[PDB]
Design a protein around this nucleic acid. Structure first.
Ligand SMILES: Nc1ncnc2c1ncn2[C@H]1C[C@H](O)[C@@H](COP(=O)(O)OP(=O)(O)OP(=O)(O)O)O1
Ligand SMILES: [Ca+2]
Ligand SMILES: [Mg+2]
Length: 430
DNA sequence: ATTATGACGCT
DNA sequence: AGCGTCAT
């Protein structure tokens, strides 16, 4: 009843760029704009691996992870842009720098948590309170929400999508009580107005379009964001949760896309998020552990407490290359050359990071994979990172891994290496 | 023969 | 610490 918390204390948004790497390439090369196009890395093997796909191309069934030669079978006129190559490896600098552009604009509106290269969570709670004071009990015009969907509406008593969007919006605004400044539905609505403004600013100043979700926590904001893409934003109210979750596959919720989600389905014999409400907190804890059990118990009711962490910069800077099939490194000279290439890119990124962000990494992590292992990493060892120098870093990396060489021969490397990975971590202010 | 990342949890 | 999971 009156003591039962409802997880409506915050307004949280998740902003995610539409087909991000593609938009970066389309801004640079107008010939790619408004075309079925994809971004690919490498080229020799099957025309390269697709990593981002424009919405026009998705209509043909082109997807991420598809080989470009295969995508071309679905979409003969597919245009491609290739990821830059430096020191023999894909170099993602252009996209990282474009990411910074967006993150800096968002940070003008509120504190953000960088969640990936192309998305950030936003805690809008305080910004909403402020805007509410400005409004002075003034109603919110639908004009202020020109790209917003209200999940679950319209309902009750309509052919085209934009018209549906507006009907839903009008039902929502018609029911709002703007008299109450602590009304969670009102707070979300004002949050959506701010997110419209943030999204407009992003597009004006970068050229990039994005989608967004607005709700009361990160998981719902994230789910909302994906409900209407591209170039639209979705508000998921506390009230919409029971209907939304009643047919929502468990795997769609962030963190349940893998083995745990699979275990939830298997052990409990259920399919949808809403079916979780029927179990006690202790029951869920017994199957999935104290922490997961509590989290699932609240989450299936639309409640989640993870804070938007104030962190705009990545916590690690890493460089990685796979050496698949026949290209696996089988000589010490090979291993040393590629560690150097990786270390050189890393030094470059580290030096720029130190200048821009006044911090220095203190730990170097070195990871490899050996031919045969089905695991991402076979071995992960750390050493001290005392100087931003590529030759030293690569020499150190070699030293920590050199014992993995089964070969009785000094020159040879066995079993061959199918992945190398250098990662700088444990930053300190400088 | 996706690849190149990046965060966080467990013990 | 080194490993595993989940994600973009
Ligand atoms: N598995 C991956 N491997 C390599 N790069 C990836 C991978 N997943 C995502 N990326 C890169 C390319 C994407 O443009 C960018 C953002 O990813 P993501 O948000 O999942 O999709 P997207 O922005 O391309 O399309 P959407 O409009 O569906 O969000 O990160
Ligand atoms: Ca995206
Ligand atoms: Mg994303």
């Amino acid at each position: 009843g009156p003591h039962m918390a409802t997880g409506q204390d915050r307004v949280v948004a998740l902003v995610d760029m539409d087909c991000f790497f593609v938009q970066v390439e389309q801004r640079q090369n107008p010939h790619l704009r408004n075309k079925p196009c994809a971004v690919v890395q490498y080229k020799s093997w099957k025309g390269g691996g697709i990593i981002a796909v424009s919405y026009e191309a998705r209509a043909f069934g082109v997807t991420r992870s598809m080989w470009a030669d295969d995508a071309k079978k679905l979409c003969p006129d597919l245009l491609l842009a290739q990821v830059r190559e430096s020191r023999g490896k894909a170099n993602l600098t252009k996209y990282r720098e474009a990411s910074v552009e967006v993150m800096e604009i968002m940070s003008r509106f509120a504190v953000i948590e960088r969640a990936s290269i192309d998305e950030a969570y936003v805690d809008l709670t305080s910004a909403v309170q402020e805007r509410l004071q400005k409004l002075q009990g003034q109603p919110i015009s639908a004009d202020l929400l020109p790209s917003t969907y209200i999940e679950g509406l319209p309902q009750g008593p309509t052919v085209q999508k934009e018209g549906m969007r507006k009907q839903g919006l009008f039902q929502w605004l018609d029911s709002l009580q703007i008299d109450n400044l602590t009304s969670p539905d009102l707070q979300l609505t004002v949050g959506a107005v701010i997110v419209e403004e943030m999204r407009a600013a992003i597009e004006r100043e970068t050229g990039f379009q994005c989608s967004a979700g607005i709700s009361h926590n990160k998981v719902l904001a994230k789910l909302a964001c994906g409900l209407n893409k591209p170039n639209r934003q979705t508000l998921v109210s506390h009230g919409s949760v029971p209907q939304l979750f009643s047919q929502m596959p468990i795997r769609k919720i962030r963190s349940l896309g893998g083995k745990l989600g699979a275990s939830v389905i298997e052990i409990l014999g259920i399919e949808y998020m809403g079916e979780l409400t029927q179990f006690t907190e202790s029951q869920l804890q017994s199957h999935f552990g104290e922490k997961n059990g509590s989290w699932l118990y609240a989450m299936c009711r639309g409640i989640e407490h993870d804070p938007v962490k104030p962190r705009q910069l990545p916590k690690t800077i890493g460089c990685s290359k796979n050496f698949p099939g026949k290209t696996a490194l089988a000589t010490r000279e090979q291993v040393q050359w590629w560690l150097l290439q990786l270390a050189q890119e890393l030094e470059e990124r580290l030096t720029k990071d130190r200048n821009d962000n006044d911090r220095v990494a203190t730990q170097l992590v070195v990871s490899i994979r050996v031919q045969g292992d089905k695991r991402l990493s076979s071995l992960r060892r750390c050493c001290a990172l005392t100087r931003y120098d590529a030759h030293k870093m690569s020499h150190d990396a070699f030293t920590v891994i050199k014992n993995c060489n089964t070969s009785g021969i000094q020159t040879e490397w066995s079993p061959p290496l199918t992945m190398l990975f250098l990662c700088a971590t444990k930053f300190s202010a400088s």
